[PDB]
């Protein structure tokens, strides 16, 4: 079990760790988060009490280094940094633990939620969507735009998700204009899966990462990307059976986890109604259709 | 974006544009079968592709063999239309290719956009005008060439005959739309108006009779009266 210590908490802030969150008061004796499960990516995120504008945060994997948070009063945010001196880090963490200045990652033993949300998410793929190669962790915030959003403005601060565009030459073959636009299987299976992602695991990883950035940061381009990757599958007549079953599980846990009060902004009515009720896969997402109908029947 | 009454003179500027109407592409007669079920029999159709500035009409005749063994023909018809318009554009020299293609029905937008991905500078647009181009098949010489076709075929017409020698393209388009609206509202009466006088003939190389300027004003008035008459008969006014 790993630890992300904090140097201090000089400004009042709501701190998120994966799907959990807690409040820290200005100059409260808080020195970080302990007992973080090894084996998964994690995200630690922030919303300042005095400016809820800009949620921001860091994706990281404790197996890749010793990370800590330190407030920067010049740039006005909590920054993640890596400590290269292992002995120094262990001694700092040990002292903060002995003084019980850390919150414990509050995982219920029965609870597979975070695994189920991050099953296919890898740090190495995160770092290719979020380009900042000098760091082993990746910063995301509410305002970052995607490469596709910029085509329709700072490239260094962009989310490089795979561009999906149903009315593009990439999606539509010479002589199969009607077939590829009404049945996206070519675009899903040959262009995206075989061509770009290489396998469905990488595709689901980007999908899951897009959802998490939408949920935790309100990142609008991430929400667009999540819906596009769902629609591309649902709008393909030919999808491997194992992918549809896995998609159903992925979406189920995403819908289960979504804050009820954010449904209005995180869920696209058109995409979901199309996917569940009109698409080729309208009968292939049993678990997801049942939770959507019981939890968000208004949207449908 | 969409084309409406605010930007109406744009039709007659010097940017090449085409209207595309697909309403006569897939045409059927519905009839009873021996067993008392209902079935359709397709008849020949046409794509109506018109340059409103010049009157040039590219009438692509859609022969009933194109739907043989094909399902969801109404959905297919918009794609067939898209495919033919795209083929027509590619067949034209670059300096004759349209800058804009205006579809009379919004369901043509995606099929044509998909067909025209190779032409990103050609704008595909809907219109809020209710244009009476479905009545094209009420023009006898156009109906005749469609029904006689035994194979796919493109036929070229100037739908304005020689009117542009005497009137502007705005006025010629207004005349055309009034004639077509009348033929759409009461074909029998409209044709009666157009031919009641045997001394005014249709030249072999024309579609409409050789009316003088004064006679066109009379005809145009009679067509308005017809449209108003039918509007009353319809609504009891
Ligand atoms: N050949 C076209 C192939 C395609 O774009 O999917 C499909 C098609 C369009 C229109 C009429 C017939 C027909 F088969």
UniProtKB/Swiss-Prot annotation, chain A:
Bilayer-spanning residue ranges: none
Listed InterPro entries: AAR2, AAR2_C, AAR2_C_sf, Aar2_N, AAR2_N_sf
Keyword Phosphoprotein (UniProt): yes
Effect annotated for changing residue 236 to A: No effect on interaction with PRP8
Sites of Phosphoserine modification: 236
Annotated keywords: Cytoplasm, mRNA processing, mRNA splicing, Nucleus, Phosphoprotein
Gene3D superfamilies: 2.60.34.20, Aar2, C-terminal domain-like (1.25.40.550)
Region described as Leucine-zipper: spans on this chain: 244-265
Chaperone as UniProt keyword: no
PTM: Phosphorylated on serine and tyrosine residues.
CDD domains associated with the record: Aar2_C, Aar2_N
Any one GO biological process: spliceosomal snRNP assembly
Pfam families from the UniProt entry: AAR2, AAR2_1st
Family: Belongs to the AAR2 family.
Assembly notes: Heterodimer. Interacts with PRP8 (via RNase H homology domain and MPN domain), competing with BRR2 for the same binding site. Component of a U5 snRNP complex that contains at least the U5 snRNA, PRP8, SNU114, AAR2, SMB1, SMD1, SMD2, SMD3, SME1, SMX2 and SMX3, but is not a component of the U4/U6-U5 tri-snRNP complex.
PANTHER family: A1 CISTRON SPLICING FACTOR AAR2-RELATED, PROTEIN AAR2 HOMOLOG
Function: Component of the U5 snRNP complex that is required for spliceosome assembly and for pre-mRNA splicing. Involved in splicing pre-mRNA of the A1 cistron and other genes that are important for cell growth.
Designated name of the protein: A1 cistron-splicing factor AAR2
Biological source species: Saccharomyces cerevisiae (strain ATCC 204508 / S288c) (Baker's yeast)
Gene field: AAR2
From Swiss-Prot, chain B:
Region RNase H homology domain, residue ranges: 7-237
Localization in the cell: Nucleus
Superkingdom assignment: Eukaryota
Mutagenesis or variant effect for residue 21 to N: Reduced growth at 30 degrees Celsius. Strongly reduced growth at 16 degrees Celsius
Effect noted on mutating residue 105 to K: Severely impaired growth. Reduced growth at 30 degrees Celsius. Strongly reduced growth at 16 degrees Celsius
Further remarks about this protein from its record: Present with 468 molecules/cell in log phase SD medium.
Subunit organization: Component of the U4/U6-U5 tri-snRNP complex composed of the U4, U6 and U5 snRNAs and at least PRP3, PRP4, PRP6, PRP8, PRP18, PRP31, PRP38, SNU13, SNU23, SNU66, SNU114, SPP381, SMB1, SMD1, SMD2, SMD3, SMX2, SMX3, LSM2, LSM3, LSM4, LSM5, LSM6, LSM7, LSM8, BRR2 and DIB1.
Function, in words: Functions as a scaffold that mediates the ordered assembly of spliceosomal proteins and snRNAs. Required for association of BRR2 with the spliceosomal U5 snRNP, and the subsequent assembly of the U4/U6-U5 tri-snRNP complex. Functions as a scaffold that positions spliceosomal U2, U5 and U6 snRNAs at splice sites on pre-mRNA substrates, so that splicing can occur. Interacts with both the 5' and the 3' splice site, as well as the branch region. Has a role in branch site-3' splice site selection. Associates with the branch site-3' splice 3'-exon region. Also has a role in cell cycle.
Domain notes: The MPN (JAB/Mov34) domain has structural similarity with deubiquitinating enzymes, but lacks the residues that would bind the catalytic metal ion.
Protein name (database record): Pre-mRNA-splicing factor 8
Species annotation: Saccharomyces cerevisiae (strain ATCC 204508 / S288c) (Baker's yeast)
């Amino acid at each position: 079990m790993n630890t992300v210590p904090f140097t201090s908490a000089p400004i009042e802030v709501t701190i998120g760790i994966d799907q959990y969150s807690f409040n820290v008061k200005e100059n409260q004796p808080f020195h970080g988060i302990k007992d973080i499960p090894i084996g998964h990516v994690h995200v630690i995120h922030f919303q300042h009490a005095d400016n809820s504008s800009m949620r921001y945060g860091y994706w990281f994997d404790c197996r890749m280094g010793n990370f800590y948070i330190q407030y920067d009063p010049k740039d006005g945010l909590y920054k993640m940094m890596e400590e290269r001196d292992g002995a120094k880090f262990e001694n700092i963490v040990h002292n903060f633990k002995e003084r019980q200045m850390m919150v414990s990652y509050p995982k219920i033993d029965e609870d597979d939620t975070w695994y189920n949300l991050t099953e296919f998410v890898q740090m190495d793929k995160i770092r290719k969507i979020v380009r900042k190669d000098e760091n082993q962790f990746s910063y995301v915030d509410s305002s970052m735009t995607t490469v596709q959003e910029n085509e329709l403005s700072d490239p260094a601060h962009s989310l490089n998700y795979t561009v999906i565009n149903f009315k593009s030459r990439e999606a539509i073959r010479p002589g199969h204009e009607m077939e590829d636009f009404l049945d996206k299987s070519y675009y899903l299976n040959t262009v995206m899966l075989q061509g770009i992602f290489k396998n469905s695991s990488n595709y689901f990883g980007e999908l899951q990462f897009a959802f998490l950035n939408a949920m935790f940061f309100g990142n609008y381009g991430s929400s667009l990307q999540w819906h596009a990757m769902i629609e591309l599958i649902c709008s393909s007549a030919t999808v491997p059976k194992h992918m549809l079953d896995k998609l159903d599980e992925i979406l189920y846990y995403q819908i289960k986890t979504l804050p009820e009060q954010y449904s209005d902004i995180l869920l696209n009515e058109r995409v979901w109604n199309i996917c569940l009720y009109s698409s080729f896969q309208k009968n292939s997402l049993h678990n997801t259709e049942k939770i959507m109908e019981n939890k968000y029947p208004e949207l449908l | 974006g969409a084309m409406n009454s605010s930007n109406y003179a744009e039709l007659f500027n010097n940017d090449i544009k085409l209207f595309v109407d697909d309403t006569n592409v897939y045409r059927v007669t519905v009839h009873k079968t021996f067993e008392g079920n209902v079935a359709t029999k397709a008849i020949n159709g046409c794509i109506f592709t018109l340059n409103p500035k010049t009157g040039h009409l590219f009438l692509k005749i859609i022969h009933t063999s194109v739907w043989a063994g094909q399902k969801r023909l109404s959905q297919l018809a918009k794609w067939k239309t898209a495919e033919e318009v795209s083929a027509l554009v590619r067949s034209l020299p670059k300096e004759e290719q349209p800058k804009q293609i205006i579809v009379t029905r919004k369901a043509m937008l995606d099929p044509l956009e998909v067909h025209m991905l190779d032409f990103p500078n050609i704008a595909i647009r809907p219109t809020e005008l209710r244009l009476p181009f479905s009545a094209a098949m009420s023009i006898d010489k156009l109906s005749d060439v469609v029904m006689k076709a035994t194979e796919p075929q493109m036929v070229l017409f100037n739908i304005y005959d020689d009117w542009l020698d005497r009137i502007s393209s705005y006025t010629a388009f207004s005349r055309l739309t009034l004639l077509l609206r009348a033929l759409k509202t009461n074909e029998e009466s409209a044709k009666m108006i157009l031919l009641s006088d045997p001394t005014i003939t249709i030249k072999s190389y024309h579609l409409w009779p050789s009316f003088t300027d004064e006679q066109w004003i009379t005809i145009e008035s009679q067509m308005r009266d017809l449209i108003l008459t039918e509007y009353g008969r319809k609504y009891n006014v």
